[model samples]
Target: SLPATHELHIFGSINGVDFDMVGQGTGNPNDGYEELNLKSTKGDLQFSPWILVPHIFHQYLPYPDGMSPFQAAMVDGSGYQVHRTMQFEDGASLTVNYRYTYEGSHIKGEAQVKGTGFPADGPVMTNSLTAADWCRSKKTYPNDKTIISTFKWSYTTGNGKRYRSTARTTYTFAKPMAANYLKNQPMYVFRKTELKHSKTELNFKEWQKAFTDV
Candidate 1:
């Protein structure tokens, strides 16, 4: 059996400006920031801290009268200065196990949370995925034509109160026209309302069943 190949990307955002000053501030401009970290046992997890570097700009001086400095300030700032640090705190651990057979690939993974400053209930989450290739097409960068299947699961504390509802997603991707998929331009669009509604309905159904079984 061969090891399965998988990629995981985690993201989070915090409002630093809203929580700037806890006291003595006329308006609460300081919004706390968010951080995201991922760990794996079987595969390597890469961190691209500079991914948003190009999107950050800076404008120290205020624009001419009638122009809004507030809006301009938000758009201008060094990436390092504006972006919150993402820390892999001590005691946090993740374990991953995966295997591939002639039929397909499977993964089982879990994580443990052991750190201060985390929610009282602590970190609780699980993830699993499987993939299979039905057909292959040869073209420029021949690897692009392989079909893939994926699934993900996440759970966390909710609203600073009860444990949050678990969330899951599953999808399939067809091989691109070429092996170097990044080289090809991509179209970005919003999800269709019907599809979104269907997903929500399905989620509710699953959520209800989970609690019912419990």
Candidate 2:
């Protein structure tokens, strides 16, 4: 179990030895949905499906207490589709989608980072995995021929704009070896990214809606 409070630290290892550089209490984004909750006006909009649905149907269902988005995911297998559109201070505008699914014993999702920028000369998505040494090892990784993800990007340049890049990330979920260890907290494995040039975009928006309705 984690400590009651969060802690932070840093260390530097040199010559098979270790020395601390700097370290401390990093905010725990993993702590809860509170971390990821975003709004242009300091979360003022408060337009969260998780928060609203439970309230509307508060008097009925599994529990009288309203459910959070994550709670719905577990009880009714109702996950969320969140689209994030943010313009960073660095003049980068990002519009990405995060789709979640509650599989047995774990929650999984396909995250389309869509950071933009698949150069005209780059390999297609399917060949992207082959671009890496470890990925080139077929036995270790798979899906080299299955290019199911699509991407489009535009890069603004001094004279003009160049097309941007598209990358696909596969997400996997995990929890503590056993829930009893603490409180059955779940976590996610990093969404591994694969680079690609030209690829067909997969449309899950409509596809997911039909399935979710059933």
Candidate 3:
């Protein structure tokens, strides 16, 4: 078992504010519930760490043969949606929401960000989407899409300062080299061997007819 953990890499910018981030996650393989913490390593507006329980991509459809878990999840109608809030030490916070949908063998999605510490004009920073042709199908081994996003919007902060950030983000998934199929090991453990042998040892008293001659 791979311990049901994932470390995803994220890179992109919001309205031109470049950022490089890492998302760390740990989960219960039996139930597929996960807690992910995302934070920025290099950037101006650092993506302060935040915890979220986004749907597990692997549990959605599972990687069957040549297809990867992400590829299968995108094709299926059961999409993934999540949002998180990152608070800055200065009392400012940002909320990011993402919604992914499948359309005609492709994955299309939208992302929006809203936060505090901005001008009075508005709080919403950016909202954008992926093209309909995003994550198309293929007949090869690596059939997953390169997850990316871009959003641009302008707003005035509570201080009457107008600003805008054209943001772009991308994600990469990684897995262990060892094959992993079963989520829970103990659940599949069998006692049939012990039971079968025990049954063979059971001996009935050789046919006894009470005083009746055969």
Candidate 4:
């Protein structure tokens, strides 16, 4: 029997190619609602720290803002538009914007969070994806057509003091698979027991890591 609380290691990709990472994760093995880690993206994660990254890349058809290949949360909203604001227990707050036209052309989305309740140590810096693309929009993971995003989050303090940092980098898969299939495959956690267990692991540490709502 798997332990109630254990680690889950995932071996997958975000876009398609670049078979060089095995994104490792941790948490309950039986839970189906575990999110991914965000503070720091492991060197080998099948997905991106930003939940929306793989969420968008894996979509063969158009879908809602938060919906994705591996992650699913059937939502209720206006087909032509969607938006929401999240208020944290602290003084911070965040707002996500999803926009599109009934014409089903040119989709756009955005997110902005004001993290509060940080020690006077310094400024609190965070990261969020401003935009990206895996296949459509006249673009794909092709090194030339590959899409990239560069968005930052921060809560500057008096004189903007900062704290510890988790440095890392992300990449896109090969161009061939980028258009046909998204790398959102079944998750696999690291285990040496050789017990041969086959069950989808929804580690929250990894699940939540891919979103900003938390």
| lDDT (Cα atoms) of all candidates against the true structure | 0.18, 0.23, 0.32, 0.24
Candidate 2: where are CA atoms >4 Å away? 1-66, 116-214
lDDT for 99 (candidate 2):
51
Candidate 2 residue 75 Cα shift, in angstroms, is: 1.8
User: How many clashes (backbone N, Cα, C below 3 Å) per candidate?
Assistant: 13, 15, 14, 22
The alpha-carbon deviation from the true structure for residue 56 of candidate 2, after best TM-score superposition, in angstroms, is: 30
Best of the two (2, 4) by lDDT = 4
lDDT string, candidate 1, 1-214, tens digits = 1112212222222111100000010111122111112232223212111211111111111212211122122323101112122222322222111211121222111211111232223432111111111211111122333212122221222233222221111111222332333232221111110001110111000000000111
Q: How many clashing residue pairs, candidate 3?
A: 14
* Ranking, lDDT, top scorer first: 3, 4, 2, 1
Provide the TM-score for each candidate, comma-separated.
0.18, 0.26, 0.28, 0.21
Candidate 4 residue lDDT tens string, 1-214: 2212222122222233221211222233223222232222233333223322222111112222333321121111223222333332234333333332211211222222222342232122222122221211111122422333222222222344322211111223222222222332221211111111112222222222122211
Better of 3 and 4 by lDDT: 3
| Cα RMSDs, all models | 23.4, 18.4, 23.8, 18.0
Q: How do the residues 1-214 of candidate 2 rate in per-residue lDDT, one tens digit apiece?
A: 1111221121222122222211111111222211011112121211111111000010011211233223443445433343433332234333444454443433333323322322223322112222211110001112221112222322333234332333332211122111221221121111111222112211100000000111
Q: What tens-digit string does per-residue lDDT give for candidate 3 at 36-90? A: 4445466333222111111113322223233333433444543344444444333
Q: Is candidate 2 or candidate 3 better by lDDT?
A: 3
Q: How much is 199 displaced in model 4, in angstroms?
A: 31
State the local distance difference test value for candidate 3.
0.32
